[PDB]
Enzyme design. Sequence first.
Site, PDB file in Angstrom:
ATOM      1  N   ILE A 192      36.591  36.539  37.008  1.00 43.12           N
ATOM      2  CA  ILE A 192      37.094  35.343  37.659  1.00 43.12           C
ATOM      3  C   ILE A 192      37.733  34.364  36.676  1.00 43.12           C
ATOM      4  O   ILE A 192      38.706  33.692  37.040  1.00 43.12           O
ATOM      5  CB  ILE A 192      35.981  34.653  38.476  1.00 43.12           C
ATOM      6  N   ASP A 193      37.242  34.284  35.438  1.00 44.29           N
ATOM      7  CA  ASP A 193      37.753  33.298  34.500  1.00 44.29           C
ATOM      8  C   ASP A 193      37.345  33.712  33.098  1.00 44.29           C
ATOM      9  O   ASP A 193      36.233  34.227  32.924  1.00 44.29           O
ATOM     10  CB  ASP A 193      37.208  31.903  34.827  1.00 44.29           C
TER      11      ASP A 193
END
EC number: 3.2.2.27
Lengths: 218, 990, 416
Positions: free
Chosen positions: A67-68
Amino acid sequence: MNSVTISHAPYTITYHDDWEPVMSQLVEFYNEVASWLLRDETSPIPDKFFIQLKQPLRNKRVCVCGIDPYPKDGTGVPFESPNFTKKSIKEIASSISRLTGVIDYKGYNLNIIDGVIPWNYYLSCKLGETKSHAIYWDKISKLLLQHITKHVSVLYCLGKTDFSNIRAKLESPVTTIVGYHPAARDHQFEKDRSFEIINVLLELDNKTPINWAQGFIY
Amino acid sequence: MDVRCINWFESHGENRFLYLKSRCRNGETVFIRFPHYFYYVVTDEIYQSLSPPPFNARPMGKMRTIDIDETISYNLDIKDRKCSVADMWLIEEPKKRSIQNATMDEFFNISWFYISNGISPDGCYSLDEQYLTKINNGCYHCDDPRNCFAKEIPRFDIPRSYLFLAIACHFDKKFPSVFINPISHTSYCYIDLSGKRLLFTLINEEMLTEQEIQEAVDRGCLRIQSLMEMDYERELVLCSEIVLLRIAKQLLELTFDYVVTFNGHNFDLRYITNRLELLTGEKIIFRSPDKKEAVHLCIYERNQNTTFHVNNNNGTIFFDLYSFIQKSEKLDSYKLDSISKNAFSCMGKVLNRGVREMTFIGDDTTDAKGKADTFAKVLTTGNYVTVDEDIICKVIRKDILENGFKVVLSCPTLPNDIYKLSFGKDDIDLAQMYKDYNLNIALDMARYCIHDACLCQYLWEYYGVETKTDAGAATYVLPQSMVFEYRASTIIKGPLLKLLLETKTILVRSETKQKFPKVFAPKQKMFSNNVLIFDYNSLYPNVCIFGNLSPETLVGVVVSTNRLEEEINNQLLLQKYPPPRYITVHCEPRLPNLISEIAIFDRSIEGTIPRLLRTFLAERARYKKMLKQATSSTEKAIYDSMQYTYKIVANSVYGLMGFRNSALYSYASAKSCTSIGRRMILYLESVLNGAELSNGMLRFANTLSNPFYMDDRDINPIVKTSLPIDYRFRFRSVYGDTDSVFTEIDSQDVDKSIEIAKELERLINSRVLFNNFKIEFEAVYKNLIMQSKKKYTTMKYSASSNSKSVPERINKGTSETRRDVSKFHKNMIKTYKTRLSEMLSEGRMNSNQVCIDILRSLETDLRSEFDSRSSPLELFMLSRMHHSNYKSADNPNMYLVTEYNKNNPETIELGERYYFAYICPANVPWTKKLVNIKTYETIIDRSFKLGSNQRIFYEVYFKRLTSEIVNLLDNKVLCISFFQRMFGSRPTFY
Amino acid sequence: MTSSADLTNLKELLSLYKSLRFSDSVAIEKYNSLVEWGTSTYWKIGVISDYYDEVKNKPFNIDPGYYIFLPVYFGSVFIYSKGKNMVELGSGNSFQIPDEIRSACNKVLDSDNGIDFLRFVLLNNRWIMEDAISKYQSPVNIFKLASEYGLNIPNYLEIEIEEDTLFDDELYSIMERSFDDTFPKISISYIKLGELKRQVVDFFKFSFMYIESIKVDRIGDNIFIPSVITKSGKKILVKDVDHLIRSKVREHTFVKVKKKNTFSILYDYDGNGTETRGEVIKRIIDTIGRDYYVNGKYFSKVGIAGLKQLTNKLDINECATVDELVDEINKSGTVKRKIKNQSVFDLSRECLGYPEADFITLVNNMRFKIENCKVVNFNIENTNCLNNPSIETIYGNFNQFVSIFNTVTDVKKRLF
DNA sequence: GCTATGACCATGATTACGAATTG
DNA sequence: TTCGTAATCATGGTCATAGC
């Protein structure tokens, strides 16, 4: 092995041919945001956002997506640590060690294993925060994930709330299994053994499986 | 302490509660917080076998559980239902657990809260202060809702607050984006609890170079330099973009009651939030009433098409009229201009003429009562007026009379006496005005934006969304913010649960359900005679009541795969299951090998679905009767909302009986309902077809007998009427479906038609039909052309009308907004439809003459247009949006864009709307066979000119035109003959 | 989610995929249903002569080693496997066998799971195992335990050679005489030592022969099979009525024949005929008589008899009167389960040996006048269904069928 | 010997995807 | 949901190869 010039930093993207048919349009989705990205300091440096584009796509079977990136000390390629300090890489290394049975390990890069691609949905994040660049990278994530889907067979998503609407995220229906939160309460990630589920899913479409032990570094 | 409820909403933290928003008589707002639990229904033995005791248990009492699984029988030995009578308990607990033998596992927890506590979602309540503890300013905590909400008091009136907003951004070539395009104007309509209504508009000054700020300030506008020095009383405010976004954030954070915006969840609010975050590191914060949870604005999606929602938790309702219009009503177009045109309209008269402008007058003595008032109310902010659906007029002067309005509109003189006025599309080019931005253009766009903002208010008042929301919350047993968010399968659970609790029955499905799997064509399209319309009064609810079709009343289903066993089974059914106690319905077989399927339904005890439908119908009838004698406007609106809600909920049962995951699923019940409905419509169509009215007698073509079993009614076809004896009428039957029936009569006098319609309705109701089947007269149709109920055009006369009355030009199916055909095509289609309508009414027609008329008209017009070549290029000018999301290999449209870009200094981006047409060199003559037409596509710029060695390829346009024409009309073989002779191709009819 | 149930189910799905047969229905339906389950929960899911090579007909050298020789017989090949039902070629029909064979097959499968399947070669209602393939071990165990149970086994041969072996027609004839089995033969299957690949050899040649006629002979209860007689008078072994109906033989004419060392079998038609099925089936039926109809692989009678079929199908001695019939049915306790669990019409169907499809499409074409659970009259409506002469024969014998239905309804009502 | 069936040709036909009716 | 355009396929022939 070609390259494209950009108006803003890093002024130049070098790449592999497997991203060719769509990456062109990428430029007129990057010039409309790069002005605001460079206002704040980012992790990693401007010269390493697109180093993941090197890896080809004609020999990859299953995808792992985050996600990040890490807020600190990110080096472009995801799910890795040169010093092996991060918690998530330790957790996945321990899970792979428990599954395969090998008890010794000091490094574990998801880039070494063939047939897999270490990926992140958002390609940037300012240090001290998480998923703070969603609006800057939304359409780029659209394009890149859809282009990856054109070749990959199985999709593995890490996270509960972040990946709760992946059903409408893509347009081509491909198999996709969501993992658990890396910091879930009660250590639900410890009980996770989704890798053999991935392998058995890859059995049913008649493709060569993947061995994780080669990804360990001793 | 008397309060009226407004909304109920959820908290989504680690500890979750229930919130109630209410208002008192004076105007105070009160929030109440309840603990929210998980609910379960268990039996006594499982209740006593729970080692960890539940938090609280309530004895429901005696309940009867019935298995409602359906089994196929191949004989006539049918096993009866398994019914179990036992004590049942309702238990409440904070946390979720799995119980192995829990029933009623399909109803929501909020419904259980409402029913168990006996709380109506919108009733007026006199709360007791003993059970309420003050925990904050304006927020109370209650843990025993059973005793706090015991007192019920009659409904009283309360004030309310509203916010309507509109946004106007900057764009030049493509759709606006957050990163490069700023916000120019922002308009608000503001209503507080005091009842005063305020209108204001903020204009950014970044595009209005300083001479223009000074001129605007001298003219009367106000300039601000900070957030704290702006007043809502001033109508126009000039400021910067940062101050504008800060004011927007401040306004959106207030504890309103309704924030209404047309398509604001996808564009307006999202743009505001993204731009605010991009310019400054600042968010919009929503806080819980108890002030221990904060959230940011993040619009989230839902699939039903795609719908967008706001994640607020303060109690305010964010409403989008776009989604409500899409769900509530079926329309041809969902543009704001089209909706406004269809909503607000009046019959106006010409009072002056001459020059370039004329005066129109309207009052309650011309069109109807209240229409002129609505038009006058809309006119206060209106700027452009549409007349005759063709002329757009810029308003010069307007004034509002005591019971009407007067306007002067700039339009060419056109000599009649009465026209129709409406508010529609504006011929305003925003992109052109953005290229040369001045002060006057800024003011004009400011008034355009304020009109757009007030249009939401006008539509909200027109549709009665507030009363509809209250009625839906009261009937469906749901919070007010959840009424227009779910499908039919979710709104039926409340009344169904109440019915099950009052009749103390439980239905159990114990087997994994299998994966089990019509349009009516009118006899002729063109009529040239009168068509009477009759409407069935809720055919499916009444047929379900008559047949007692319920999942628990099904005795069994008998299948047979051969006629010998089918015959012996029919004999055994007639011997063992005779009318009137039992009813046997044929259905189409569910398996390929089976040839006969017969379902048996009992009628000794009323079922569950028939009881629900009967209750709904009776309540709707009572509310209509109460509305009829009502005097106050508020009471009339409330009663209309209630009856509309009952009509909506009572019409969703048939769809739910066929929905697999629904709570009322029954294959055999749905099949039987459909079969009996078709049998009834076929019987009525058969008996009406060929009926004659002569002297004082009326004769039907078939015997007036009940088509299910023998009855004691007289079955003599000859019926004595009360009409004058000189009439000689012959009737025919053309179209018939579930909802309505059409009857053709050969006359053009409408007074005779309506009187015969009333008499025939009375005779059919009193003499032909039986039990609880009724029909009602709807309207008279003149010059009806139809392919189906989806696509038709005609003139409609209402039942309560005379010959000297304005007809309704009803016309649907056609789009007139589907923007990729032509400009010549639409206009000439309109001309041909008008011509068809005008010779339809002569009378001495028959059938195969008007086909010839239209064919030779098309021939002459096509020859003249091809020979003269006098039409300008823009009449054949097409559009298409450009995007790179194209599959396959080449898709030569992209390639065409490539050579256009590499051949012309002008460059098309990936979001432009590019204009194209069809071009071919002039040397080619008229062709018969067609080829790949994408090779003939060319792109047209603003500066392109038709060269002397090419011309517009008329063949494709004319082929499409004549194709849509031949889709009409009645004659068959001559049509293919003509199409072969002109184009040498097979037309695609229907 | 990472539930262990999902991964166990996924292994079950892969095992089913590895054990999928197109003929079976229950396993196929369950596997497909799990496919929709997976593609609903996961949005997508990845999803005979397999062990037999080409048959060798010319002499050639074979590799020295260990050879397992098993004679492949004349007949129709049927299959049975674990977790399924009886399996055959094409039609997917079924038949009746006492459950002790099912118990023996259960013992075979649970004692050894390595055996792939059990295939039978079928002929004249005498039904014996021939060969099977076991992956884990040598094929000795399966037939040695079969003969341990009591059923007969083929005369397997084990030949160990250390030099090149020439496989000509003469040595094949020597081996066939070594078998010394009077049953018809078609080929020899030879199995290596440690290799799962199965290979077969059939030596044959073609010539021309002359026929005299085609008659029909008895096999069992109502079972009749046609056979064509030659110039030499040798009995030509017809597989079934399907074999002759696709052979399309022409009377009073020479036809090609695949001649063996001792046999001469008529092979499948290799011509380019254009005559359609209709007039040729009427020709063969009128040549063979009005009393014969093709009920699949055999023929049947049209005789009246009437009462002399129930006792055969109720597995009891001769009966003379309906009263003593129902008395015997009442006293014999093991029978009422069959008469109760099973319907009436199909009982009268198998009592007369009628084919399902033809009879059902025939009965779906008349009108029947009945009274008190008794059929009394019938009349036909459509004539096109009668284009098949078998339909005409069934319509003719419907007079006996009506009495059979009436008497079975009588006994059903009388018993209970 | 002509008349029979395989690879070649298309009129007329349904079936398929596309992409808009989105705002 | 409709409407439009390729693509594929099957019912109308013809002729080269080849059999009673």
